[PDB]
Amino acid sequence: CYCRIPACIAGERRYXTCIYQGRLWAFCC
Amino acid sequence: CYCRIPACIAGERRYXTCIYQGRLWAFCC
């Protein structure tokens, strides 16, 4: 899985949010 | 990367945190 801003994209599944590099991201798989 | 409780596993290190299902998780890569 990985972190994306602002949103996960088609084909992915979101499981909450990353706090990574001092930023908030969607956690996408 | 993965979000884990309680901790990262072998082959991974912590790169931040996740928020999912009302809890904080280790962000592991």
Side-chain angles (χ1 to χ4, degrees), chain A residues 19-25, chain B residues 15-16:
Chain A
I19 308 177
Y20 174 58
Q21 304 184 143
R23 299 166 69 180
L24 300 175
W25 316 64
Chain B
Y15 282 89

PDB file of all heavy atoms in Angstrom, chain A residues 19-25, chain B residues 15-16:
ATOM      1  N   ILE A  19      -0.059   9.606   8.353  1.00  0.00           N
ATOM      2  CA  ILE A  19       0.691  10.758   8.856  1.00  0.00           C
ATOM      3  C   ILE A  19       2.144  10.422   8.502  1.00  0.00           C
ATOM      4  O   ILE A  19       2.767   9.527   9.098  1.00  0.00           O
ATOM      5  CB  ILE A  19       0.515  10.981  10.351  1.00  0.00           C
ATOM      6  CG1 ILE A  19      -0.975  11.027  10.725  1.00  0.00           C
ATOM      7  CG2 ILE A  19       1.267  12.248  10.695  1.00  0.00           C
ATOM      8  CD1 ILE A  19      -1.251  11.166  12.174  1.00  0.00           C
ATOM      9  N   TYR A  20       2.657  11.075   7.467  1.00  0.00           N
ATOM     10  CA  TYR A  20       3.924  10.706   6.816  1.00  0.00           C
ATOM     11  C   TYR A  20       4.553  12.000   6.258  1.00  0.00           C
ATOM     12  O   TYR A  20       3.870  12.797   5.603  1.00  0.00           O
ATOM     13  CB  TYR A  20       3.660   9.681   5.702  1.00  0.00           C
ATOM     14  CG  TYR A  20       4.860   9.329   4.854  1.00  0.00           C
ATOM     15  CD1 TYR A  20       6.000   8.809   5.411  1.00  0.00           C
ATOM     16  CD2 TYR A  20       4.836   9.529   3.484  1.00  0.00           C
ATOM     17  CE1 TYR A  20       7.107   8.486   4.624  1.00  0.00           C
ATOM     18  CE2 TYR A  20       5.920   9.187   2.697  1.00  0.00           C
ATOM     19  CZ  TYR A  20       7.056   8.671   3.281  1.00  0.00           C
ATOM     20  OH  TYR A  20       8.164   8.369   2.517  1.00  0.00           O
ATOM     21  N   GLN A  21       5.824  12.187   6.552  1.00  0.00           N
ATOM     22  CA  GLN A  21       6.547  13.399   6.156  1.00  0.00           C
ATOM     23  C   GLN A  21       5.839  14.657   6.649  1.00  0.00           C
ATOM     24  O   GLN A  21       5.883  15.716   6.019  1.00  0.00           O
ATOM     25  CB  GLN A  21       6.774  13.455   4.646  1.00  0.00           C
ATOM     26  CG  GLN A  21       7.504  12.194   4.130  1.00  0.00           C
ATOM     27  CD  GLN A  21       7.809  12.271   2.685  1.00  0.00           C
ATOM     28  OE1 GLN A  21       8.897  11.779   2.262  1.00  0.00           O
ATOM     29  NE2 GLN A  21       6.924  12.759   1.892  1.00  0.00           N
ATOM     30  N   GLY A  22       5.198  14.594   7.805  1.00  0.00           N
ATOM     31  CA  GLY A  22       4.499  15.749   8.363  1.00  0.00           C
ATOM     32  C   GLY A  22       3.232  16.157   7.670  1.00  0.00           C
ATOM     33  O   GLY A  22       2.741  17.242   7.947  1.00  0.00           O
ATOM     34  N   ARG A  23       2.686  15.280   6.824  1.00  0.00           N
ATOM     35  CA  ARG A  23       1.515  15.544   6.010  1.00  0.00           C
ATOM     36  C   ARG A  23       0.489  14.454   6.236  1.00  0.00           C
ATOM     37  O   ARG A  23       0.824  13.352   6.678  1.00  0.00           O
ATOM     38  CB  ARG A  23       1.905  15.577   4.515  1.00  0.00           C
ATOM     39  CG  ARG A  23       2.932  16.683   4.165  1.00  0.00           C
ATOM     40  CD  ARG A  23       3.529  16.468   2.796  1.00  0.00           C
ATOM     41  NE  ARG A  23       2.525  16.701   1.746  1.00  0.00           N
ATOM     42  CZ  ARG A  23       2.806  16.575   0.455  1.00  0.00           C
ATOM     43  NH1 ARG A  23       4.002  16.098   0.082  1.00  0.00           N
ATOM     44  NH2 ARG A  23       1.878  16.910  -0.448  1.00  0.00           N
ATOM     45  N   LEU A  24      -0.743  14.775   5.893  1.00  0.00           N
ATOM     46  CA  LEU A  24      -1.879  13.828   5.921  1.00  0.00           C
ATOM     47  C   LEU A  24      -2.177  13.333   4.510  1.00  0.00           C
ATOM     48  O   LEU A  24      -2.352  14.137   3.586  1.00  0.00           O
ATOM     49  CB  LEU A  24      -3.120  14.500   6.533  1.00  0.00           C
ATOM     50  CG  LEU A  24      -2.982  14.998   7.959  1.00  0.00           C
ATOM     51  CD1 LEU A  24      -4.211  15.739   8.406  1.00  0.00           C
ATOM     52  CD2 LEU A  24      -2.542  13.934   8.932  1.00  0.00           C
ATOM     53  N   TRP A  25      -2.285  12.034   4.351  1.00  0.00           N
ATOM     54  CA  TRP A  25      -2.485  11.400   3.056  1.00  0.00           C
ATOM     55  C   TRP A  25      -3.586  10.327   3.164  1.00  0.00           C
ATOM     56  O   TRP A  25      -3.831   9.774   4.237  1.00  0.00           O
ATOM     57  CB  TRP A  25      -1.253  10.647   2.566  1.00  0.00           C
ATOM     58  CG  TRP A  25       0.095  11.300   2.703  1.00  0.00           C
ATOM     59  CD1 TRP A  25       0.717  11.630   3.849  1.00  0.00           C
ATOM     60  CD2 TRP A  25       0.995  11.629   1.640  1.00  0.00           C
ATOM     61  NE1 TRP A  25       1.968  12.141   3.591  1.00  0.00           N
ATOM     62  CE2 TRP A  25       2.148  12.163   2.234  1.00  0.00           C
ATOM     63  CE3 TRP A  25       0.938  11.536   0.242  1.00  0.00           C
ATOM     64  CZ2 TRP A  25       3.242  12.583   1.493  1.00  0.00           C
ATOM     65  CZ3 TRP A  25       2.010  11.971  -0.474  1.00  0.00           C
ATOM     66  CH2 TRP A  25       3.155  12.482   0.152  1.00  0.00           C
TER      67      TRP A  25
ATOM     68  N   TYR B  15       7.935   4.491   9.385  1.00  0.00           N
ATOM     69  CA  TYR B  15       8.065   5.756   8.657  1.00  0.00           C
ATOM     70  C   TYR B  15       7.036   6.807   9.050  1.00  0.00           C
ATOM     71  O   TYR B  15       7.028   7.879   8.460  1.00  0.00           O
ATOM     72  CB  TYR B  15       7.998   5.514   7.157  1.00  0.00           C
ATOM     73  CG  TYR B  15       9.358   4.967   6.678  1.00  0.00           C
ATOM     74  CD1 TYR B  15       9.627   3.640   6.672  1.00  0.00           C
ATOM     75  CD2 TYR B  15      10.452   5.787   6.409  1.00  0.00           C
ATOM     76  CE1 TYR B  15      10.799   3.105   6.247  1.00  0.00           C
ATOM     77  CE2 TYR B  15      11.658   5.243   6.036  1.00  0.00           C
ATOM     78  CZ  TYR B  15      11.812   3.883   5.990  1.00  0.00           C
ATOM     79  OH  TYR B  15      12.999   3.270   5.619  1.00  0.00           O
ATOM     80  N   UNK B  16       6.106   6.490   9.958  1.00  0.00           N
ATOM     81  CA  UNK B  16       5.074   7.422  10.403  1.00  0.00           C
ATOM     82  C   UNK B  16       3.971   6.631  11.074  1.00  0.00           C
ATOM     83  O   UNK B  16       4.244   5.584  11.676  1.00  0.00           O
ATOM     84  CB  UNK B  16       5.627   8.458  11.368  1.00  0.00           C
TER      85      UNK B  16
END
